[PDB]
Every structure is written in C-alpha cells, then in structure tokens.
C-alpha cells in the first residue's frame, strides 16, 4: 500500500520479504560469467518453445552502455525496469563526466536501488540478482554481483539462478587465471551445461571485449556442444 512497510523485520532478525525474493531469484534461469585478462565471457540459459516461439525477441545479454553489460535471473519485467533505470543513470553519469561509466559505479548504484526497494514503503523488493561486467576507469575487467538484499561483492567467476551452488563449486574447482578466449567460452559453456541439458538451443553465450559485446555464432556453439558431448563419454 502507499506509505506502508511491505518488508519488515521478523522475530528472528530476518527480512522475510527479502528472503522470498531470494528463493524467487533461485527459481529463475541460470547465468554464468567468467573474467580473464581484458575480457569477460557471459552466458545465460535460453528457454523457448520450438516451432512456435521466436528466439530473437528473448534477449538476456543486453548491453547497458558502451562498456558495461548486465545479465540477470528471475523476474524478467523487474529486470527490464531496473535496466531502464540503470541505462538512464549511465547516460546521466556519462553526461556529467564525458567519460564512460565504470562497472563499479553502476554496480554500486544497482545495489543502492535494490536496497531502496527493500527499505521504502509501497515498494516490494526487486526479484532479481543482476551481475554487471565491464571495465573500470583504470580499464581493467571486473565483475560484480548484486542481490535483492542490495549486497554486492566483486567476483572472478560467479553464477546465479537454479542450481547455482553446483556451478559455483565447479567454477571454484576448475577456474584458472589468464585464460584464452576459446578456453573462457568453453569453461562458461561447460559450467552452464553442468546444470542444463546439453543442447545448442539453451545457450546464447557472448564475449565482452573493449570494442563491444560480440555474440558467438551458432556454428561455434554447435561445435563446442558436440565436443563437450564427445568428452563426456
């Protein structure tokens, strides 16, 4: 309601509304992100009905600005609204600086907004946990990961969505430093397919470089999933 605390403290010091936002995030689709050297591959789970649904409209690896990019899991409309807010905020920041928006500032802004929706009356928490990837003013690749609670922390290789813990353990076991582009894309594909059925149509991986977010072609994805299927047996 208008001017009404939707989220309030529970008897055991917990925000139940923020908790409900957390399992709402966990029920969403998966998404993996890796960083190395000066680029960061990004992957999301794709879910479309064959022969009826249009894969083109279903977009998950949006670009926020010239450099930063954002993936998400959970409520799609909430993600779209916060994306509009963050894009407008990036253009505000680029108006005042005349310099590109670093990843740390927009990550902090996303954390601030998601905290604000967990502390204002008449607003429920945002049911998403977005992770931003981009270059700072120093021009070093970094990845952050927000949550509905508004907590953010820098990450080297992080995943979200359904069965997130298995992908996190796999990345923690297998991640190396200063990897190649093909190695990074292979690791991201294997990480998402650890908790996703092995098929080309369920991934839309793209590589973020300082030029742009280049979407990987379908033939490369087909070759890599066939290679992973061969390696599994």
């Amino acid at each position: 309601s208008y001017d009404r605390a939707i989220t309030v403290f529970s008897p055991d010091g917990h925000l139940l509304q923020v908790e409900h936002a957390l399992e709402a995030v966990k029920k969403g689709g998966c998404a993996v992100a890796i960083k190395s050297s000066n680029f960061a591959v990004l992957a999301v789970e794709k879910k479309n009905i064959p022969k009826l649904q249009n894969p083109k409209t279903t977009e998950k690896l949006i670009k926020l600005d010239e450099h930063n990019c954002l993936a998400f899991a959970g409520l799609n409309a909430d993600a779209r609204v916060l994306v509009n807010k963050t894009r407008l905020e990036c253009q505000r920041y680029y108006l005042n600086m005349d310099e590109p928006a670093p990843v740390d500032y927009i990550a902090k802004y996303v954390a601030k907004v998601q905290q604000k929706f967990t502390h204002r009356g008449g607003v429920r928490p945002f049911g998403i946990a977005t992770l931003i990837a981009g270059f700072k003013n120093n021009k070093e690749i970094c990845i952050y990961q927000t949550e509905p609670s508004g907590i953010y922390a820098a990450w080297k290789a992080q995943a979200i969505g359904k069965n997130a813990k298995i992908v996190q353990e796999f990345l923690e076991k297998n991640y190396q430093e200063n990897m190649e582009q093909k190695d990074c894309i292979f690791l991201a594909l294997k990480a998402i397919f650890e908790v996703v059925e092995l098929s080309s149509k369920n991934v839309e991986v793209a590589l973020l470089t300082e030029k742009d977010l280049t979407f990987i072609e379908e033939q490369e994805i087909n070759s890599m999933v066939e290679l992973i299927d061969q390696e599994r047996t």
């Binding site: 309601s1 208008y2 009404r4 939707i6 509304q17 409900h20 936002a21 399992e23 709402a24 966990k26 029920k27 479309n48 009905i49 022969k51 009826l52 649904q53 249009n54 083109k56 409209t57 279903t58 409520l75 799609n76 409309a77 909430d78 779209r80 609204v81 008449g122 607003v123 429920r124 928490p125 049911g127």
Partner: protein, 240 residues
C-alpha cells in the same frame, strides 16, 4: 490496516499471489489465436455467446486497432482491455507526434508491459487482468507478434494461443504450420485450430471473427472479416 489486501507481496516460496489469480482469469476467457504468415499477420478470436440479441455487426469485442499499423486482441476482462488499449493508442500517437514515425511494436509492448508492471510492483492496487497479442508490421524486422501478460513478461511468437483450451490450440499450431504460408492457408489454419479448441467439427460463422494486416503496395492495410467472408472461408474449409 487490518483490511489490507496486500497485493504487492511475494508468496511463501517465490511468486506474487494475485498475479497467479489474474493468470487464472486469463485461463477462463474466450480463446484467441495468433499467427504469422508470409503475406500478413492473422489474429482470430472466439466470441462468447452472451445472447442471440447481441448486435453481431460491428461489435468486434476481441480484436481492436491501436494504430494505423498496429492491432491487438484480448483474452481477459474487456473493461481493463479498453483502458489499456486506450493507453497503447496514446503512447503510439505520442511517439508518432514526437519522433514523426510509425511506432515499432516492440516499444509499444514494452510500454504496456511497463504499465502492467507498475500495477504489479508499485502501490497496492490490484494488477491488470488481461493478456494481449500485439502484432503488426514495421520496416525494422518485417512482421512481428508478441504475447504480454499481467506479470510484465513478453516474448515473440510465430504462432500462439491464449484463453480456454490453449494447450489444444498450441498442439494444433505445432503440427500444421509452415514458414512459406500464404494468407488463405493461414486463415484455414485459424479456422481449423479455432474449431479444434471449440470442440465443434464445423465452425459456426456467428461464433467467430477474424482479421489480418496486409502490406501490399508498400502500405499497411488492416482488414477485419465480416459474416459473409467468414461464411465463405468456412465453406472453403469444409470443402478441403
């Protein structure tokens, strides 16, 4: 305080309660079909039999025109549909007023989803219990069709259905559908899936209505089917 409905509130596990009940209303309305064809975009609908004394001529309560190049159809509450279609008309005409171009349908469905998400998230008022099937033509990506919902999600669809018996309509569309389909074949497929969803063998002419958007001669033109051409289409359908 004690009389609060608490609309904008998550469930115990992961969901907005009222948004589910709104979806159940979408599951308790007349079926609406949507198709993509090689020479237009077809969107039929099933007319609920309120009474035989309803003025059948020029009372198309399912499909409406939002703009000269955009139309839509509803499978929920008509009173909400009127206001939402009015706001869609206002946004499309304001875009044409400011930017001096025909509205891309993606922007329009994004804005109507923003309306439905604002009622989903902000305030305490109940959400909008209606789902649209916005489709049209633009030079950016040719013919397009979308499927909005009260939760604010949306996505493209080459062919889709909403309302009662939507699973049967989706199953029929999955089998009999082709990319290089002419307008007549799409109309016959619309008749077939509407008859299958309604469970009747012969479609009733008074109980259905159809429309399409042809882009002949480099100019958008919507045509809404009346009783005579519906009867002709049904006669050709039964004879093939």
């Amino acid at each position: 305080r004690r009389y609060d409905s608490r609309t904008t509130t998550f469930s115990p596990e992961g969901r907005l309660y009222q948004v589910e009940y709104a979806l159940e209303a979408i599951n308790n309305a007349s079926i609406t079909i949507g198709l993509i064809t090689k020479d237009g975009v077809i969107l039929g609908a099933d007319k609920v039999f309120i009474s035989k004394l309803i003025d059948k001529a020029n009372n198309y309560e399912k499909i409406y025109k939002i703009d000269k190049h955009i139309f839509c159809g509803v499978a929920g509450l008509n009173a909400d549909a009127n206001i939402l279609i009015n706001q869609s008309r206002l946004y499309a005409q304001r875009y044409l007023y400011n930017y001096n171009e025909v509205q891309p349908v993606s922007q329009l469905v994004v804005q109507i989803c923003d309306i439905k998400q604002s009622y989903t998230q902000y305030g305490g008022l109940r959400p909008y219990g209606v789902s649209f099937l916005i489709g049209g033509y633009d030079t950016k990506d040719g013919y397009q069709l979308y499927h909005t919902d009260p939760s604010g999600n949306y996505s493209g669809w080459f062919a889709t259905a909403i309302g009662t018996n939507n699973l049967t309509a989706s199953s029929v569309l999955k089998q009999e559908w082709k990319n290089d389909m002419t307008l007549e074949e799409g109309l016959l497929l619309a008749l077939k899936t509407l008859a299958k969803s309604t469970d009747t063998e012969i479609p009733k002419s008074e109980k259905i209505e159809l429309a399409y958007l042809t882009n002949k001669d480099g100019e958008v033109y919507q045509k809404y089917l009346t009783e005579k051409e519906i009867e002709e289409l049904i006669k050709l359908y039964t004879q093939k």
